[PDB]
Amino acid sequence: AAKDVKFGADARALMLQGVDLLADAVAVTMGPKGRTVIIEQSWGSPKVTKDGVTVAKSIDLKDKYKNIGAKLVQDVANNTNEEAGDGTTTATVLARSIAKEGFEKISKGANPVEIRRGVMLAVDAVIAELKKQSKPVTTPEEIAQVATISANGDKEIGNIISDAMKKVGRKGVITVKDGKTLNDELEIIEGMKFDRGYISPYFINTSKGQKCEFQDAYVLLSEKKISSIQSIVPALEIANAHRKPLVIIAEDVDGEALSTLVLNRLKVGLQVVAVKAPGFGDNRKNQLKDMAIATGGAVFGEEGLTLNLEDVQPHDLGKVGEVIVTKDDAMLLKGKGDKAQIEKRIQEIIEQLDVTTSEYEKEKLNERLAKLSDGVAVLKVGGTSDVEVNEKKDRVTDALNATRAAVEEGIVLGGGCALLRCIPALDSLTPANEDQKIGIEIIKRTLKIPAMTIAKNAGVEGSLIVEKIMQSSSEVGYDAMAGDFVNMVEKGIIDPTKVVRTALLDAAGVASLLTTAEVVVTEIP
Amino acid sequence: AAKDVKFGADARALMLQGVDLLADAVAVTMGPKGRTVIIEQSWGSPKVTKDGVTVAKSIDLKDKYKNIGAKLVQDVANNTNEEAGDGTTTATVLARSIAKEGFEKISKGANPVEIRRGVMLAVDAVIAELKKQSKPVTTPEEIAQVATISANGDKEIGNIISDAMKKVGRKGVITVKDGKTLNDELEIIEGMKFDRGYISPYFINTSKGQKCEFQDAYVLLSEKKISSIQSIVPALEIANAHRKPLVIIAEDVDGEALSTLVLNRLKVGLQVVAVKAPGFGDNRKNQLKDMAIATGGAVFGEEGLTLNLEDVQPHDLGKVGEVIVTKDDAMLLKGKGDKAQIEKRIQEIIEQLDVTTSEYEKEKLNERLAKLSDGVAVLKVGGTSDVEVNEKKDRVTDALNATRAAVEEGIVLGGGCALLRCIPALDSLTPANEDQKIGIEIIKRTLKIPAMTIAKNAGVEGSLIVEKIMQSSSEVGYDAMAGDFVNMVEKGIIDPTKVVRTALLDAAGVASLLTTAEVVVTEIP
Amino acid sequence: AAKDVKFGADARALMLQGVDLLADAVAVTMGPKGRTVIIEQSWGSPKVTKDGVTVAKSIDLKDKYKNIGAKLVQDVANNTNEEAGDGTTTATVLARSIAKEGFEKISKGANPVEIRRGVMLAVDAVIAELKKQSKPVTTPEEIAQVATISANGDKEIGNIISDAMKKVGRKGVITVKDGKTLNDELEIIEGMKFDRGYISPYFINTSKGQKCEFQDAYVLLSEKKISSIQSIVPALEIANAHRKPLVIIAEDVDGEALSTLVLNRLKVGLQVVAVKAPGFGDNRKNQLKDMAIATGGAVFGEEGLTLNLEDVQPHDLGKVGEVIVTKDDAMLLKGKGDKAQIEKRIQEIIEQLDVTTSEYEKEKLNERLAKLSDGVAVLKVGGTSDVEVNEKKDRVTDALNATRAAVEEGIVLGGGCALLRCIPALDSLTPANEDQKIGIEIIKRTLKIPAMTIAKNAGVEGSLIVEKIMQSSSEVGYDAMAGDFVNMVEKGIIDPTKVVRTALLDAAGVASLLTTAEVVVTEIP
């Protein structure tokens, strides 16, 4: 495979020319006044959209170096911001602006590593300032306010969100479902969730949204890894006898099992899904034991009690009402089993919390406790018809992910004004040398970019708006919807702090990586 | 898949150059004096035609951006106006005119969003004026007048249309059939219709017209969705034993059932069709219960009474005389079952209407009531031979769809004069700024376009006609057929108001979407 | 499928340049002095010919627009004149001349629709004049004269033609056959003919002439359509047991039956042919009943008497001596069955004619009567050897079709002089405006075209001949064979009036359609 190689500024120029296409195509769709972008798909109608992540995930350039620039911006600013579809555009625009500004200085004689150090210093100072001028959200009234704000004034949606949240706590688990009724209602049910996603992207069922959904499946628990281990088909025997699905939880899946399952799901699509074990080490073992207690099954490891995957009985497996598994996330609903032995295990974990003393110990114990003592709250959204319910479910999920992101680290002024308020923090910072001072001036400039872009999307003169917002009060900002200055928190122009912080971090990281890369090696066409 | 990306005016120019080809190819065939368009099909004779929707659905450009412009105009102005073949051309021409006029101003410095706001304001004012200067149709005499007018003076066709309509009411159901006789006659028969179309476009039988027709089929009712559920073939067993067809009604069809049915219909074409459930939620369940009562079958859900798709008996399914299903529309004819239990269910729904009180409740109850208490009227058109009957059936369907569209929202002056009479309404409107004033001048101009185009198609000087019609009386207009001014309602130059309103709405929407699009991303060849 | 689109004069120019190639290639072979045209077929010798329809059906241009022009002229001037091979060339030449003349005026500022109206007025006046100056043929002496004239003086052929005609009447049925003898002789035999052609072009047997011939076949009668209905193979069982063929008459054939029959005829060629039902409605049913009475079979509809296609007995089907079926035409010969019940059915139809009173009723009754009471006359042509008989059969068919066309609407002066005599009728016509006057001058010119072309083919100066024929007597014309003026009816330069009328009608229609077409959309190569 013959390769081509370019060096220094010669390759950085091409990477930047590839970046500023994605940046321009995404910066259009920022803010509430975001315009539309026509994306031609081959067979059907050209898809119109106003959503930054779709535009970003779409484009793919022809030239090799431009494509690697675009892909470098994408696979971080997008892949690292899967929580909400709001921070990705900000990340890409900040990244392009930092990179383009720094390329000028390093082409005019500055030292790249010094600029990267200065930029990292500035970004640390700005994140520090953010963590100060933020304000938390810890009372159900404020929770209702922020929820309703995120749902665009829907008092009912914000109300039901706060009701679920204050019922299952801040660290609880929340899910949305379609209640087949006219009115939305909140329900709490038996279930448990852990943070291990699906292993096979071919497992995708109910494809839209990249999910994997199955009903009343059987549950398998295996401490021993089933990597390159056939004889999984004994379980499939009873899983075909009883048409109910089955789920398997192994230390890992590889070789025989992996290759057979991917292909048979591709061609038959049998109702089984594989997921990695949730915990680690002894905590993993005790977690699988708790899950077996909660599902009515048993671990399929040979240690202790004798049981193998070579044979299966209907009472050996576990049973639950529903299961949902997606990227990095998986959950189980309405588990079967010994309801009295579940309480016995709860008491066991209580006495464990009583006896153990270390931070890690009691932490993992609280995790295992909450994973069984507290149920999940399902939001049964409803409406007149599925054409309404399918859209309201998406709005509810958006508002839910917004408020969950807000409760973690508070909220700040929306509309990109937050970064504007953090500019005076750069004054106190002192550079070690003049290159590290240019590394501060760069952030000084690039912090005003999201506000300028939202203003320009609203059709208004950007710099005129940003200079006035800068000199104005600390609590007032620009509302692109109404086109005039307003008290943001009062009006509701807010956004979670985690989003701004993550966006700025990823932007700085990618821009550094892209302005210090010295050698680019690409295939030859 | 390498993509290409263009920005702003540079892409809008190409999209507009792609639009004005479809607009020119369709504007020719407008009015009664519409010319002809030679469409070469590959194998046979070049098809001559004077029908706007065929010309529109035909063309498909070479360049990518021109093609997306043409497709943007098509997939709305056509797909949204499937009711009658008259509004689509008007929609496309209005869209092109608005877009071309606005592109000039936004190339001369105006703000796109402001123009779109002004245009939306003007369109709202014009639709308001239409809803005023319209006049309803609510008496059988006026119904006969408008029917005969739509059928081009055929007193017999309009008479039979009004007879069917006043017999089954305004909201009744009407169908046309071939009576195998010399004289057309009206018949009312047992049946029911709901608004869920076919799921598989491969189901098309009696292909011309995109329909699906079957006789004396069996009826299946399944509240449980059969998505990715095999064992549908038990029913197919008895459906092959008795050569009579079968229809299935499920919450949904997917996976196993979908993939098997599409392919076996492609290669064998077995006499079964799948359709989505008609209602929603509890209303869906009660609707399926009423349909089972009306057909002699039973719901195949496991709840309550035990019954599965794994086994079928001839008396488990429903039975009807005929079934027709098309896009968004499906109906059943001459259902079997307990004629006494049908009356019992009718009394049940009557007492339900008595007890329940909410608007939604009594609305759905009236729907379920009328879906069983009132039969459908079938129009048995007849003639000397099928070469006449096949054409008369199409004329009758056209007149029927025209009068049904007229009874909903009244009628207005035909020949595009209606929009001309709505021009003085734009005087009272006031703009917030000068861009929103150009957004009014644009509609001021584009409202005169359909009349100008019909006049030009008649070979007459357009502006000369439109200025005289503007200054003339409110009730007089231009008759391109006779080539002179005439009292329209008196002569019969009319058209339903719904058509003009929908055409103007879709035109404004598409023109806005096309004059504000900022980024176009297309595949590379 | 990317398309290309041209507008107005720009596309009409290309269509006309495509037309004037077919027109020139066919105008050569007009008249008796028609020259020859070398048509290269790929494998064998280049086929020489002097026949206009073969030259026309042959050519097929390269460019798309030229090809659609040529195909537009072809698929009407040919497809509408399948009766005799004489009118097609005249139609194409008149069409080209009108179109080329009108393109000049519409390129010099005239209104196309006005010209089309004027041209239609002129053509109506000319057809009126023709219907006046024609003269009928209603006596056996005149029949013999016109027959002998059409057969180029063959007294024997004209004599036998008149003998058959005056024996079976003007509306009788006549067929030609090869008598295997030295002398031609006339025979009348049992049979019946109806006007429904073959359904499958793959049915072609005895391929030359596009016919379908079979001997002593079985006859099937099915009122119920066999569209998408298998189990036709029960009949094929006995149709293979007895090697005699079978014919089926269904309301329609589609799906299962169509797809199986086309392919098995392609690969096996079993001796069965399918034809559409002859009549319509109740008349269709009574016609099938009469045909069953006449053939010894029975209708295979389930109504009344029980009988299905699922089973067949040798006495259920009908039986006839011979059957011939071609495009739009099908006939049966020497039917079997109850010769006494046939007379009983005849008496039934007689009493029906007695009781019924409406025009349509007695008309259909006379049709059903004559279809059984009167036999067909077969012309057994003969000669020394098949090399002579095969050519004499074609000459006899030509003369027969000529005299049958003459008896319908009389005869006129041959050699294109008829249209010349109709020129003075255009004087009385008055135009509404000057464009409709150019629409008269165009026909004034184009009427002299066939005579000019025949003269030029004879090598003589055309205009010199046409001016002298114009000023000469009403009964004298030009004989290109002898090259001098002669009394046409006396010499025998005649042609049926139907041919001239149809040619002029089709020419005017195509020329209008081609000079008013505004948009041409063609595939891109």
Swiss-Prot record, chains A, B, C:
InterPro entries tied to this protein: Chaperonin_Cpn60_CS (IPR018370), Cpn60/GroEL (IPR001844), Cpn60/GroEL/TCP-1 (IPR002423), GroEL-like_apical_dom_sf (IPR027409), GROEL-like_equatorial_sf (IPR027413), TCP-1-like_intermed_sf (IPR027410)
Modified residues (Phosphotyrosine): Y65
Keyword Phosphoprotein among record annotations: yes
UniProt GO BP: 'de novo' protein folding; apoptotic mitochondrial changes; B cell activation; B cell proliferation; biological process involved in interaction with symbiont; cellular response to interleukin-7; chaperone-mediated protein complex assembly; isotype switching to IgG isotypes
Modified residues (N6-succinyllysine): K6, K57, K100, K108, K166, K177, K180, K193, K211, K225, K276, K327, K371, K456
Annotated localization: Mitochondrion matrix
Family: Belongs to the chaperonin (HSP60) family.
Entry keywords, A to Z: Acetylation, ATP-binding, Chaperone, Disease variant, Hereditary spastic paraplegia, Host-virus interaction, Isomerase, Isopeptide bond, Leukodystrophy, Mitochondrion, Neurodegeneration, Nucleotide-binding, Phosphoprotein, Transit peptide, Ubl conjugation
Name the record gives this protein: 60 kDa heat shock protein, mitochondrial
Function of the protein: Chaperonin implicated in mitochondrial protein import and macromolecular assembly. Together with Hsp10, facilitates the correct folding of imported proteins. May also prevent misfolding and promote the refolding and proper assembly of unfolded polypeptides generated under stress conditions in the mitochondrial matrix. The functional units of these chaperonins consist of heptameric rings of the large subunit Hsp60, which function as a back-to-back double ring.
GO MF, one example: apolipoprotein binding
Positions with a binding annotation for ATP: K50, D86, G87, T88, T89, T90, G415, D495
HAMAP family attached to this UniProt entry: CH60
Cellular compartments per GO CC: cell surface; clathrin-coated pit; coated vesicle; cytoplasm; cytosol; early endosome; extracellular exosome; extracellular space
Classification via Pfam families: Cpn60_TCP1 (PF00118)
Reactions catalysed: ATP + H2O + a folded polypeptide = ADP + phosphate + an unfolded polypeptide
Entry EC number(s): 5.6.1.7
Linked pathology: Spastic paraplegia 13, autosomal dominant: A form of spastic paraplegia, a neurodegenerative disorder characterized by a slow, gradual, progressive weakness and spasticity of the lower limbs. Rate of progression and the severity of symptoms are quite variable. Initial symptoms may include difficulty with balance, weakness and stiffness in the legs, muscle spasms, and dragging the toes when walking. In some forms of the disorder, bladder symptoms (such as incontinence) may appear, or the weakness and stiffness may spread to other parts of the body.
Subunit structure: Homoheptamer arranged in a ring structure. The functional units of these chaperonins consist of heptameric rings of the large subunit Hsp60, which function as a back-to-back double ring. Interacts with 2 heptameric Hsp10 rings to form the symmetrical football complex. Interacts with HRAS. Interacts with ATAD3A. Interacts with ETFBKMT and EEF1AKMT3. Interacts with MFHAS1. (Microbial infection) Interacts with hepatitis B virus/HBV protein X.
Residue positions where N6-acetyllysine is found in the record: 50, 57, 62, 66, 100, 105, 108, 131, 166, 177, 180, 193, 211, 224-225, 244, 267, 289, 327, 334, 364, 371, 444, 456
Positions bearing Phosphoserine: S42, S45, S385, S463
Modified residues (N6-malonyllysine): K108
